[PDB]
Amino acid sequence: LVEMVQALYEAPAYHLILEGILILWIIRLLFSKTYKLQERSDLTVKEKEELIEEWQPEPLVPPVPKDHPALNYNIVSGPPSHKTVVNGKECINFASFNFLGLLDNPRVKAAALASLKKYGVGTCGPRGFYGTFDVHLDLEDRLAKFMKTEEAIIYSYGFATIASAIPAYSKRGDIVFVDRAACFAIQKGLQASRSDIKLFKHNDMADLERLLKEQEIEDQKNPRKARVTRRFIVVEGLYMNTGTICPLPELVKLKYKYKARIFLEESLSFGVLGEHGRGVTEHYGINIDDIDLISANMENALASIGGFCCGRSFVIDHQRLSGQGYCFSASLPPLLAAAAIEALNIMEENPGIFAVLKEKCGQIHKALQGISGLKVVGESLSPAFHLQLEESTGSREQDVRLLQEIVDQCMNRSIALTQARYLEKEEKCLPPPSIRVVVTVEQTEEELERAASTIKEVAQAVLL
């Protein structure tokens, strides 16, 4: 070997460079695993034209079946409120999410009319370009003070609120643990972001613990990647699809033990739970600072269009520049904002309406128990719950038809009920068909018991 080294050293430089490049060439041939065939063919103009001519597209919309229950919309001849007229029949409203009866107060209408006189209807632009009014800032300050939180942000549409809040913080590569029974807005927000989604059983902290333990096991394998991966837990204060509350304290413990932030959705529970009606945090006594982001809409309780998100400035300031429903859309009309402000004033003046609503919900939930063919799904504290078929048929269409039969027969009996509506092909976890019962402080005890008796009679007559 030494003699070979000396002989190689005896060689000129160009000769050795040539030998080296030849050896590199040999390596390239040896590792040229691609077996090219040396061919090239292209299509002909007539071939392209005939290929274009063969193609025939599908219709834009599929042919419609005439049996669609959703093809028929109930028509309300007037404002949806207590003693409404549905399909020309005078009824009592048990279907509209108007918990505090703030839709038809004279004060709310007066404030809305004053703002309409001052400003008009439209805002004519986004918040960036001369679409910010003083009413918007006033309402944001009022919401922040009401929720005992640093900052709040307003969207002009309930769906877009959470559907734009979620993708702003969760990006591609992060992990989101979301409850199985989550509203469609949360699902669309999670789809808009490209993060990894891990569903867990409804209100089951055992499954959440198992998933978090699996995630920690995966973190132990590649710590470098685990140091740049964020974890979120998206839950609802009061679920719409089931009517059940969520266990906050266990979620807070799991957050602080596994380093995973919490996003709370509080559309149903914003103005109905707690002594002062600030959500489920007052119901459980949890500190507001433990929850990173709280999202609600101003439609169910405040009886006006819009939505909002509340939190610390550190998290809220990001949405003013990353929320798509905020940056690329017109701001909320001033009269709706004034109505929301007046509703907040009314809620702050007297907090006994929440107790009244709680007691009415207790009465109606206790009275409704005992139907032969129907079962109540939901908690006693929920203002809106469900009635479901105890024994169901093989297919869903017959269940829907039976529920609509019950609804129509009740509506002929001066009780206006509604049936829960879903997108069958789109929902991640499709809930069973059910009849939705909604409670309002306007409803009297006699009306509630009359509704319970009528529902019992109609259900036992129809299911039998």
Partner: protein, 492 residues
């Protein structure tokens, strides 16, 4: 496709020296931003920002610092040209609440004084329907008194009203299509109806300058998205041919559907879509057409029916015609118009139809009154004077600015005038100088646009009188002399 009238548009190229100076400015800004980031990291200079709570110091950081680079170093310096509050109706003249900052726009303090009578060139009221006194205001007040504000349910649920049916039938009459549907948000219309029409296995051909709502709606659906050059019919035809011929990418199969997303008037560029060519191409290649008509439904057309009337075409040729009431009619909302079968399928299978709260009664009443006034149902001479005045104002303003030596984008008919600034500092300089002279404008910078073109958008209106336009033009001439914004070589 053929045009019954000449189709004039101009997009003049950037002078080379201007581009070089733009790059010089951006490089200086980037270097000083890196220096400021280095200073802030080592706590040499105290950071004026909010931080994570002490109990969550061991969590993974919520944001990535580098993503906020341009926000910390470029946006924050000229932050006072945006989010200007107003305390008056956004008419031809608006009142702006005055604010000042002492820490270089990191925080704003509100002074008591109020700027009054600022000429409004940033609001979207094309036909001047944003008024606090009128017939529409009285109708909205009556409907607010009767129905209240806001509905508390969904359309498929008890939340469907008679006002909504009246609005839908009136909109269908106004457009000329068989049927139409109305929603409570223009963004939501696209974002919630595009996923319904197409899905996995279909192709979406999207223009280069589509709105964020159209892009989000296309992303939410599982379809494949391909982008063609802005108003380039050659690129659209090439993409259509390749899509039909070569099939799906991995497993070569015929496409289930082909949908073309286009807009009537592109706001930032200022151009109008070549509708006859697009219609001819879609007829030849058997594609479907989605037409976003937010900026042209009231501005364009002899009677203000939109782009299809502007080109004198047949509304039955466009498969889906979407539109927004915010721009021209002065009230929030949106609509989709088309054939009856499409509208029924949308009423059954739309996200906003099932899960979202419907419109507000005062808003629908204001829309109804405004659109009746536009189509002349009231019988008053108004509704034609607005369109004629908008056309005259657009023509006069565009001609006067083009003969002053400025560079302007778009057609001669579009009521949106993008003036060109081309440099990062001139953005803030123009905004501040124009506000100092009582003109309100909108300025757009780098990350929104391409790097070399940064612009200022003027939105004309039918409520702008001739004296207002003359005052604005003389102030614009003075500022252009001050900042040397007359880059045009053709005429000056």
């Amino acid at each position: 496709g053929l045009y019954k009238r000449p189709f004039n548009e101009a997009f003049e190229e950037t002078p080379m020296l201007v581009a070089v100076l733009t790059y010089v400015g951006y490089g200086v800004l980037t270097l000083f931003g890196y220096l400021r980031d280095f200073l802030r990291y080592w706590r040499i200079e105290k950071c004026h920002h909010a931080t994570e709570r002490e109990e969550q110091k061991d969590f993974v950081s919520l944001y990535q610092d580098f993503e906020n680079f341009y926000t910390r170093n470029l946006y924050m310096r000229i932050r006072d040209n945006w989010n200007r509050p107003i305390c008056s109706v956004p008419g031809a003249r608006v009142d702006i609440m005055e604010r000042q900052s002492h820490d270089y726009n990191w925080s704003f303090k509100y002074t008591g004084n109020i700027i009054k009578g600022v000429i409004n060139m940033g609001s979207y009221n094309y036909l001047g329907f944003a008024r606090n006194t009128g017939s529409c205001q009285e109708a909205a007040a009556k409907v607010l008194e009767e129905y209240g504000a806001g509905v508390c349910s969904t359309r498929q649920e008890i939340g469907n009203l008679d006002k909504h049916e009246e609005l839908e039938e009136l909109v269908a009459r106004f457009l000329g299509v068989e049927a139409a549907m109305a929603y409570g948000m223009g963004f939501a219309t696209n974002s919630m109806n595009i996923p319904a029409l197409v899905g996995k296995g279909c192709l979406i051909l999207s223009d280069e300058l589509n709105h964020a709502s159209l892009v989000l709606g296309a992303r939410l659906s599982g379809a494949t998205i391909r982008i063609f050059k802005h108003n380039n019919m050659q690129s659209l035809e090439k993409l259509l041919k390749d899509a039909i011929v070569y099939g799906q990418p991995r497993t070569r199969r015929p496409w289930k559907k082909i949908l073309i997303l286009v807009e009537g008037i592109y706001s930032m560029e200022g151009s109008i879509v070549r509708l006859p060519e697009v219609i001819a191409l879609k007829k030849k290649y058997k594609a479907y057409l989605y037409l976003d008509e937010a900026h042209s439904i009231g501005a364009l057309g002899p009677t203000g029916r939109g782009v299809v009337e502007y080109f004198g075409l047949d509304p039955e040729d466009v498969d889906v015609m979407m539109g927004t009431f915010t721009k021209s009619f002065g009230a929030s909302g949106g609509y989709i118009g088309g054939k009856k079968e499409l509208i029924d399928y949308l009423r059954t299978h739309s996200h906003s139809a099932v899960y979202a709260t419907s419109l507000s009664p005062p808003v629908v009443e204001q829309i109804i009154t405004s659109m009746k006034c536009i189509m002349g149902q009231d019988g008053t001479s108004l509704g034609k004077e607005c369109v004629q005045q908008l056309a005259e104002n657009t023509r006069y303003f565009r001609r006067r600015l083009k003969e002053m030596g400025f560079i302007i984008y778009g057609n001669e008919d579009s009521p949106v005038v993008p003036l060109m600034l081309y440099m990062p500092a001139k953005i803030g300089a123009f905004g501040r100088e124009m506000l100092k002279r009582n003109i309100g404008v909108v300025v757009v910078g780098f990350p929104a646009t391409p790097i070399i073109e940064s612009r200022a958008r003027f939105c004309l209106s039918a409520a702008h009188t001739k004296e207002i336009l003359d005052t604005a033009l003389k102030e614009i001439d003075e500022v252009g002399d001050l900042l040397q914004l007359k880059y045009s070589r053709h005429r000056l």
